[PDB]
């Protein structure tokens, strides 16, 4: 049925047969705007490669007749919905793609691919036999993002991955309509940008002798040198590759902290420069806030950043320095503080980060940073963007009420380096970027969200995939789909289909995740009973569903363990019409810490007026009766 | 691909590939008989939309052997088997559908449909993706019905469903080759046929304030008015729609009982007319059999019935009046009985139905009624007797007296009953020839009828649930030769046929189709049992040395019989002497509920002089009180 | 790679869509070599019938490049790899079949068949519904056999099957690229070759009253007469049937032992001729080696053999006579040993086989025999077939100038059960004798697998014993040693089995999923269980050092000894404390074994983390159980 991730804003389904691309189908451009023509050509190349169909570009050929073509239109009425909005009208007569801005057409194409057979992505095989149907019926889609900032961050400073890997990540982002690549390119353990005025930033800072592994303070090492960096020509190519796929790159140059690799290259940049690039991930060196050379150096670097990154926003990091380890007691710090009348080390960081916002602004750019740039001593430039990642949400809300745009990256929801125990798939999908205590008038200041793939413990592309996917798919939906249309069980079904595409595209996403059952699948589902140690003193259990049996069809009963030392063993679940059985699903299930076949399918008859309907479930405690659970009843 | 329900009478399979309908295929008529030409237009129109292929009608001689074409022949050889017989000769040379009467061709086309992909029935399906193969090999089919009367009754008096629903029912009947729609159109709770001479029959009799729900005497009501009736224009349109699909409509005007709606419309028609159309289903009002105006009124009604229903037979119901509630101690009745020398209230009823049989005969029609109309001024010998009661001697005597009889034993054919009361198996096992009837009389047993009473049926979907799939079983009972009936095979065929019902929108009962029944194994070898004593060990050995004669798949079925505990099955293996040569190790459970109780073993080509042993590892589930039987099928 | 059995020697895959044959496809020959034009017509006939496509032959230059065409070229470069070598270049623009010798084109065709839908083998199947793709991508194959002698032996002396059955055996051999049919046609219990000069060999020797069943000296029999033989016309027909499919027939006339049938027909041929053709399989009668009549009679037989069997090599068996039962204490033997100075009965047999090898050499042929023929003079060109695992003897045979074939009986005797020789043992067989030095390897020309038929009385039982282990021996004979891979072979054997089904081969269906401890001599062991360990349900096995890549790892719990099995409920993989994969299903590991393999999805490993396999199992009826837990990577 409907399988697009993100789920689009407005969908209208019609009855009949769907559109199908054939060897006779054409792509017609009914506009002269060349931005739309460039998108049309890029759309032709993509669709032809994946389907094998020729799909040549023509403004003529009429619209054939019984050969559904692709029509690209420029519809001004969608402009109220932003430059990323588009509409799709699909029927056997035609497939019309419209947008106010050319970027909408690209996203229309991605929706088109996701409504076609997944084999589109196969690099092998006979595709001349595929039925290239667009969904299962005719339809009208009007679509647009809830949030304008839908970001994925890749940390290449902790471990470098390179052009091939990041282009493959960009491909996943575009297919999910994520539009910001936050590129964390500098940190203590690596510097990954060629700066032509300062060659040692890469010739020294891009190489280290070994890497700590396992976890922080593991005492374990791989004893393996690690190096890599991007040349400025590579960065230009990747910027272009991303922009063609509707993605703006936000570069991050960490400061005043996370500066070890830069300091080793040029030791005057820090008051406590390490002897070599750190081999452990527990070292955080800080730039010297008391020497103009620091600011002069950083401004020269930022000059080259702006020449090769056209995006308006530059991320400085700006998270808190480890004051005790780095500045406390250093004479250059204490005198600097006494002179300028500063009471705290945090005041010294605020001074640095405020000065950098003026340096960034004088380059025609806009500064972004982690929420410490805002506070907790003068105040920060109102134009600065704040990425919230930790603390009381009152800090983000205070910044919003003071006039800052905010990106919600609360680390307990969005840090993809964490395990699936720490952030399960349902926690990623249930993330709500708009802080709940924030008054409605302020909501438009929450521009969106960012998911972070930190790479201390990620050294291969396949491990990067394992950590980033499938949860990045959830964040793409949180960023795009209207809040009122979010639906976690439905998202997980669509995720199964989408996981075929990830396989064919080489993405080693986490396996044991997509098909789990969690209690969050059932907030929108009726509850018909429970079990307790007391109800386990019998094995036959009856639950009334009279009010829920309104029509013929399939009903799914789920016995979901909640807590207790013991699971339940389930023999069968049946539906009774009055006192007679009319459907039974007999199969062994176990609902406890592990959930094994806990869903039972019941076939309801067209209801008998005046009859009662009862779900009867035969189950008992497994090794004991300390078991609590809930019985859910789905009526699709 | 012998999927057809009902099972055809004679089939001979060949070797090779089957015929396939392409966009080149044609339908050519090899006969000028107009009845065949009208049916060919029907066949072409149906098949074109189902398959999405042109399938053009071209006069004979324009047959290109590029593509297999459909040939519609007329073969007088088939007349020995009646007007509904036909033959299908299938091969890439072409598909030849022959028949002595045009009705045979229609059924040939329905069989054609059940041999093609089910996508035929999907209206929005991608039909151009399909290969329209007729079954899977060449074949000759010589088909005809065992019984001439294969009827389904729809009650629209209790609840009215209307034109769209009844055409949908007619469609399912036609695909199952059922040929009689018994239309129960009047009863106590409704009158659904427009009678122009007596407009209150519909203006009053077709409306009631509310309906009892749940069951008789429930004390529950839906509080919802219910109304509806067919105009005579609607009935003519539905008569033709049915006639196109080989179905004769037998109308029923209930009498002398089930008269409440007629009486309330015209209170002189009953001695105990209710004050309003009953809101419950326990009220059964009787026409007044002592008054001439009653007979003249009903004779008038039947005049209008005959004008719009072309069928030869008119049903009156004629089941017993509730004598003690309606007639006993009523002065008119008691004196009528003295004047006529009658000793029982049944005598009064029989006088009424006897007289109605003459009134109907004089209109050039035949009366039909339930067995109450038959006994030992008198009953027209051309009357048809339909039996709800299992009384073989009464049917014997009716046959000797010259009556065609129809068997509708209510404990087997009443589809308003639950599946506990009448399981699918019991419907399929129904034998219309009354048990013990001497063979001399079998030929007057003209068929069967299955009844959908609608007291507790208010939607088309619930009508489907009660009517199907047991109506499929009766279609087979009525068509298939008795010696070719095979319930296990019917169940396999029904599983396929239910795909068609799904796409056609028939909300049949889903849980009743794919059961395993103990009767399935009556002629399957028994290699062992289990008892509480044998469940004290995990491993169980059964000798099958004398049964393993060829390589291939052997099926072990561990079938629970009785006891408080099921058995949980870990694996079943085949041993050649002391060597394991096959093991099916899926988890199974056989008890009150059946969970994967069939185990597939691959036998080697048998080795001379070797012992073969089925070893089954199983134990009691929760205890040892369990008995069952182990069956062994060869390929 | 492909699904072809045997695995080709060199494969190169590319991205994209595969070549596809259509009704417009043609077969084009770009060589004038008439041997290639002949193979091309035979290929056309075979492919058009299987696919239902017309596939007409067209000359180079008169074709439309609309559809993919098959192009047949002669490539002398492949000559260094022998006459059976070939290459295939396939893409949507064409399918080029190349070979140095016309025999290679036939094997190129057999590989094409295995890369197309299996409906090819269904004579009645719906062939027009099928997309005739050559595999799933463009590819380049260069292929050639490792061994030149890839033999299957069928014993029709013990039980006669006949022409229809041997031809369907030949069809399998050809699809598997086996090139030698070793035809065991004479023995104690039957003589199956018509010899016109000695008509009693078949009129007497081809008939027996009944057959022993069960096992040797069972005392049981079937009370059923059994008879049959091939006429010389039938032989010539089967010889050319094999030759059209790249197979040379090596006939076998057993001597000096296994002679009962011959002797009963002509009693002067043995010193201990039985009274009737034996009806048990333990009787082994010896020809009389001390009498000139025997050699004259056998030379006459071999004259007729050479006229209907054209191949260079004739097999005599030559295995040891039952000396104590047949020759010891016989006056003619003891006097013959005195006259000639022989000290052992084996010397008498060696004199016999040595002399037969000269008789066979004088007819323009090469003698072949079991290792007893090597250990007046043995013809230096004789071929030695080893049922005995004796490397020093094979080395000496090679040093004395003999080609040798390896048929180690404990690995290649397909009359044995699958317990004695499981599929994996057949596949793991190495024809190069263990310990043989490299300089001698070139004289190991291949292998032979033997279907003895004492206990095989039907074609279907022949299939059950012969297949699928014959499929493994086909791969041993052809595939390079370093490209062998038993798991991948079982994967391909699944697909090859559809072809066997459609072609009527009643192969043993259960054996591909058998598991033996021998399956795991080269698989890591991550732990064991013992009566000690069975006191708890949860068990933990470290696999930190073994998790190196993403994908499916397999845990096998294999019972070794003890009076009790274990019942298994679940097996899970843990990354530190995070459960990351769980295979929950019921299994049992004891005298019989069910579902004892558990499949786990490893993520891309996290450097420095610990990976732990956790398994739930307990004792079945007790705790006297010992086992080994194995761990396989993807
Ligand atoms: C602002 C920020 O996110 N800093 C670090 C980040 O660099 C990374 O090390 C992460 C790993 O979980 O932990 C954070 O404390
Ligand atoms: C979410 C997070 O990373 N929190 C802190 C962070 O401040 C980091 O800088 C480090 C300092 O030691 O410890 C972490 O626990
Ligand atoms: C919540 C839960 O799964 N509890 C136990 C489980 O830990 C396991 O010990 C087994 C014991 O029988 O089944 C369940 O009773
Ligand atoms: C002759 C006959 O079938 N009469 C009634 C019928 O009208 C219907 O009410 C049915 C419901 O089961 O009960 C029968 O007694
Ligand atoms: C006859 C029968 O099925 N008995 C089963 C019993 O064996 C056991 O499985 C139990 C599970 O708690 O359910 C019972 O209904
Ligand atoms: C040399 C040789 O293989 N001789 C016999 C062979 O004839 C056959 O009887 C086989 C059956 O197992 O046993 C072998 O010992
Ligand atoms: C090694 C082995 O299988 N031992 C089993 C034993 O554990 C128990 O299960 C018993 C049940 O029948 O049978 C024995 O053969
Ligand atoms: Cl005998
Ligand atoms: Na569509
Ligand atoms: Na407020
Ligand atoms: Na003799
Ligand atoms: Na672990």
PDB file of N, CA, C and O in Angstrom, chain B residues 264-294:
ATOM      1  N   UNK B 264     -52.268  -7.695   8.403  1.00  0.00           N
ATOM      2  CA  UNK B 264     -52.274  -6.306   8.858  1.00  0.00           C
ATOM      3  C   UNK B 264     -52.621  -5.375   7.703  1.00  0.00           C
ATOM      4  O   UNK B 264     -53.313  -4.366   7.884  1.00  0.00           O
ATOM      5  N   UNK B 265     -52.149  -5.698   6.497  1.00  0.00           N
ATOM      6  CA  UNK B 265     -52.517  -4.909   5.328  1.00  0.00           C
ATOM      7  C   UNK B 265     -54.005  -5.035   5.023  1.00  0.00           C
ATOM      8  O   UNK B 265     -54.654  -4.047   4.659  1.00  0.00           O
ATOM      9  N   UNK B 266     -54.562  -6.240   5.166  1.00  0.00           N
ATOM     10  CA  UNK B 266     -55.973  -6.501   4.872  1.00  0.00           C
ATOM     11  C   UNK B 266     -56.533  -7.422   5.948  1.00  0.00           C
ATOM     12  O   UNK B 266     -56.535  -8.651   5.802  1.00  0.00           O
ATOM     13  N   UNK B 267     -57.026  -6.853   7.054  1.00  0.00           N
ATOM     14  CA  UNK B 267     -57.317  -7.677   8.243  1.00  0.00           C
ATOM     15  C   UNK B 267     -58.363  -8.764   8.046  1.00  0.00           C
ATOM     16  O   UNK B 267     -58.405  -9.697   8.857  1.00  0.00           O
ATOM     17  N   UNK B 268     -59.212  -8.690   7.021  1.00  0.00           N
ATOM     18  CA  UNK B 268     -60.166  -9.776   6.818  1.00  0.00           C
ATOM     19  C   UNK B 268     -59.486 -11.092   6.451  1.00  0.00           C
ATOM     20  O   UNK B 268     -60.138 -12.140   6.502  1.00  0.00           O
ATOM     21  N   UNK B 269     -58.196 -11.067   6.106  1.00  0.00           N
ATOM     22  CA  UNK B 269     -57.504 -12.268   5.652  1.00  0.00           C
ATOM     23  C   UNK B 269     -57.175 -13.242   6.777  1.00  0.00           C
ATOM     24  O   UNK B 269     -56.780 -14.377   6.485  1.00  0.00           O
ATOM     25  N   UNK B 270     -57.326 -12.841   8.039  1.00  0.00           N
ATOM     26  CA  UNK B 270     -57.010 -13.703   9.167  1.00  0.00           C
ATOM     27  C   UNK B 270     -58.067 -13.549  10.249  1.00  0.00           C
ATOM     28  O   UNK B 270     -58.678 -12.488  10.403  1.00  0.00           O
ATOM     29  N   UNK B 271     -58.270 -14.624  11.007  1.00  0.00           N
ATOM     30  CA  UNK B 271     -59.150 -14.575  12.166  1.00  0.00           C
ATOM     31  C   UNK B 271     -58.482 -13.947  13.382  1.00  0.00           C
ATOM     32  O   UNK B 271     -59.178 -13.621  14.348  1.00  0.00           O
ATOM     33  N   UNK B 272     -57.163 -13.752  13.348  1.00  0.00           N
ATOM     34  CA  UNK B 272     -56.408 -13.202  14.469  1.00  0.00           C
ATOM     35  C   UNK B 272     -55.336 -12.247  13.938  1.00  0.00           C
ATOM     36  O   UNK B 272     -54.144 -12.387  14.193  1.00  0.00           O
ATOM     37  N   UNK B 273     -55.772 -11.255  13.176  1.00  0.00           N
ATOM     38  CA  UNK B 273     -54.847 -10.299  12.579  1.00  0.00           C
ATOM     39  C   UNK B 273     -54.171  -9.466  13.664  1.00  0.00           C
ATOM     40  O   UNK B 273     -54.858  -8.926  14.536  1.00  0.00           O
ATOM     41  N   UNK B 274     -52.845  -9.329  13.647  1.00  0.00           N
ATOM     42  CA  UNK B 274     -52.189  -8.448  14.623  1.00  0.00           C
ATOM     43  C   UNK B 274     -52.503  -6.979  14.371  1.00  0.00           C
ATOM     44  O   UNK B 274     -52.987  -6.583  13.309  1.00  0.00           O
ATOM     45  N   UNK B 275     -52.208  -6.158  15.384  1.00  0.00           N
ATOM     46  CA  UNK B 275     -52.448  -4.729  15.274  1.00  0.00           C
ATOM     47  C   UNK B 275     -51.429  -3.985  14.440  1.00  0.00           C
ATOM     48  O   UNK B 275     -51.729  -2.900  13.934  1.00  0.00           O
ATOM     49  N   UNK B 276     -50.232  -4.543  14.288  1.00  0.00           N
ATOM     50  CA  UNK B 276     -49.205  -3.960  13.439  1.00  0.00           C
ATOM     51  C   UNK B 276     -48.342  -5.093  12.902  1.00  0.00           C
ATOM     52  O   UNK B 276     -48.389  -6.221  13.397  1.00  0.00           O
ATOM     53  N   UNK B 277     -47.550  -4.786  11.881  1.00  0.00           N
ATOM     54  CA  UNK B 277     -46.594  -5.792  11.404  1.00  0.00           C
ATOM     55  C   UNK B 277     -45.710  -6.214  12.572  1.00  0.00           C
ATOM     56  O   UNK B 277     -45.110  -5.346  13.238  1.00  0.00           O
ATOM     57  N   UNK B 278     -45.610  -7.506  12.889  1.00  0.00           N
ATOM     58  CA  UNK B 278     -44.867  -7.913  14.087  1.00  0.00           C
ATOM     59  C   UNK B 278     -43.448  -7.361  14.106  1.00  0.00           C
ATOM     60  O   UNK B 278     -42.771  -7.287  13.079  1.00  0.00           O
ATOM     61  N   UNK B 279     -43.009  -6.963  15.299  1.00  0.00           N
ATOM     62  CA  UNK B 279     -41.639  -6.540  15.548  1.00  0.00           C
ATOM     63  C   UNK B 279     -40.763  -7.677  16.058  1.00  0.00           C
ATOM     64  O   UNK B 279     -39.562  -7.473  16.257  1.00  0.00           O
ATOM     65  N   UNK B 280     -41.337  -8.853  16.291  1.00  0.00           N
ATOM     66  CA  UNK B 280     -40.601 -10.034  16.710  1.00  0.00           C
ATOM     67  C   UNK B 280     -40.850 -11.158  15.712  1.00  0.00           C
ATOM     68  O   UNK B 280     -41.776 -11.108  14.896  1.00  0.00           O
ATOM     69  N   UNK B 281     -40.014 -12.188  15.789  1.00  0.00           N
ATOM     70  CA  UNK B 281     -40.061 -13.299  14.851  1.00  0.00           C
ATOM     71  C   UNK B 281     -40.769 -14.523  15.417  1.00  0.00           C
ATOM     72  O   UNK B 281     -40.755 -15.581  14.781  1.00  0.00           O
ATOM     73  N   UNK B 282     -41.407 -14.402  16.582  1.00  0.00           N
ATOM     74  CA  UNK B 282     -42.137 -15.514  17.175  1.00  0.00           C
ATOM     75  C   UNK B 282     -43.624 -15.489  16.835  1.00  0.00           C
ATOM     76  O   UNK B 282     -44.362 -16.393  17.249  1.00  0.00           O
ATOM     77  N   UNK B 283     -44.086 -14.487  16.098  1.00  0.00           N
ATOM     78  CA  UNK B 283     -45.501 -14.347  15.769  1.00  0.00           C
ATOM     79  C   UNK B 283     -45.750 -14.983  14.405  1.00  0.00           C
ATOM     80  O   UNK B 283     -45.127 -14.599  13.409  1.00  0.00           O
ATOM     81  N   UNK B 284     -46.664 -15.952  14.358  1.00  0.00           N
ATOM     82  CA  UNK B 284     -47.008 -16.664  13.125  1.00  0.00           C
ATOM     83  C   UNK B 284     -48.527 -16.656  12.972  1.00  0.00           C
ATOM     84  O   UNK B 284     -49.228 -17.424  13.636  1.00  0.00           O
ATOM     85  N   UNK B 285     -49.026 -15.801  12.085  1.00  0.00           N
ATOM     86  CA  UNK B 285     -50.455 -15.625  11.868  1.00  0.00           C
ATOM     87  C   UNK B 285     -50.922 -16.477  10.694  1.00  0.00           C
ATOM     88  O   UNK B 285     -50.208 -16.623   9.698  1.00  0.00           O
ATOM     89  N   UNK B 286     -52.132 -17.021  10.812  1.00  0.00           N
ATOM     90  CA  UNK B 286     -52.709 -17.906   9.811  1.00  0.00           C
ATOM     91  C   UNK B 286     -53.779 -17.179   9.010  1.00  0.00           C
ATOM     92  O   UNK B 286     -54.584 -16.426   9.570  1.00  0.00           O
ATOM     93  N   UNK B 287     -53.778 -17.403   7.696  1.00  0.00           N
ATOM     94  CA  UNK B 287     -54.905 -16.993   6.873  1.00  0.00           C
ATOM     95  C   UNK B 287     -56.168 -17.704   7.346  1.00  0.00           C
ATOM     96  O   UNK B 287     -56.110 -18.783   7.941  1.00  0.00           O
ATOM     97  N   UNK B 288     -57.319 -17.086   7.084  1.00  0.00           N
ATOM     98  CA  UNK B 288     -58.614 -17.670   7.426  1.00  0.00           C
ATOM     99  C   UNK B 288     -59.016 -18.679   6.356  1.00  0.00           C
ATOM    100  O   UNK B 288     -59.385 -18.282   5.243  1.00  0.00           O
ATOM    101  N   UNK B 289     -58.966 -19.983   6.640  1.00  0.00           N
ATOM    102  CA  UNK B 289     -59.315 -20.976   5.619  1.00  0.00           C
ATOM    103  C   UNK B 289     -60.807 -21.199   5.438  1.00  0.00           C
ATOM    104  O   UNK B 289     -61.190 -21.996   4.573  1.00  0.00           O
ATOM    105  N   UNK B 290     -61.655 -20.534   6.224  1.00  0.00           N
ATOM    106  CA  UNK B 290     -63.094 -20.763   6.194  1.00  0.00           C
ATOM    107  C   UNK B 290     -63.842 -19.744   5.345  1.00  0.00           C
ATOM    108  O   UNK B 290     -65.066 -19.840   5.228  1.00  0.00           O
ATOM    109  N   UNK B 291     -63.143 -18.786   4.741  1.00  0.00           N
ATOM    110  CA  UNK B 291     -63.766 -17.649   4.074  1.00  0.00           C
ATOM    111  C   UNK B 291     -63.330 -17.595   2.615  1.00  0.00           C
ATOM    112  O   UNK B 291     -62.131 -17.642   2.318  1.00  0.00           O
ATOM    113  N   UNK B 292     -64.309 -17.489   1.709  1.00  0.00           N
ATOM    114  CA  UNK B 292     -64.001 -17.464   0.282  1.00  0.00           C
ATOM    115  C   UNK B 292     -63.124 -16.275  -0.086  1.00  0.00           C
ATOM    116  O   UNK B 292     -62.290 -16.378  -0.993  1.00  0.00           O
ATOM    117  N   UNK B 293     -63.301 -15.140   0.593  1.00  0.00           N
ATOM    118  CA  UNK B 293     -62.511 -13.959   0.260  1.00  0.00           C
ATOM    119  C   UNK B 293     -61.017 -14.229   0.391  1.00  0.00           C
ATOM    120  O   UNK B 293     -60.214 -13.623  -0.327  1.00  0.00           O
ATOM    121  N   UNK B 294     -60.621 -15.132   1.290  1.00  0.00           N
ATOM    122  CA  UNK B 294     -59.204 -15.458   1.427  1.00  0.00           C
ATOM    123  C   UNK B 294     -58.660 -16.070   0.140  1.00  0.00           C
ATOM    124  O   UNK B 294     -57.614 -15.652  -0.370  1.00  0.00           O
TER     125      UNK B 294
END
